[PDB]
């Protein structure tokens, strides 16, 4: 499954962006 990484805060999960923001990057697991 795909995940999301926020380069601004450095947070990421398997859920929706850890904030539904920008900076977030959808990558492969």
d(C-alpha 10, C-alpha 18), whole Å: 10
Q: Where are the alpha helices (DSSP H) in 1-29?
A: none
Rounded to an integer, what distance in angstroms lies between the CA atom of residue 24 and that of residue 9?
9
Domain ranges in the chain are 1-29
Question: Distances in Å between the alpha carbon of 23 and those of 8, 12, 29?
Answer: 6, 11, 18
The approach used to solve this structure was: NMR
Q: Which pair of tokens denotes residue 16?
A: 């929706």
Q: Phi-psi category of 10—alpha, beta or left, where left has phi over 0 and alpha has psi -120 to 50?
A: left
Q: Which helix (H) or strand (E) holds 3?
A: strand 2-6
């Amino acid at each position: 499954r795909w995940f999301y990484f926020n380069r601004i805060t450095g947070k990421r999960q398997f859920e929706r962006p850890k904030g539904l923001v920008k900076g977030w990057e959808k990558r492969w697991d």
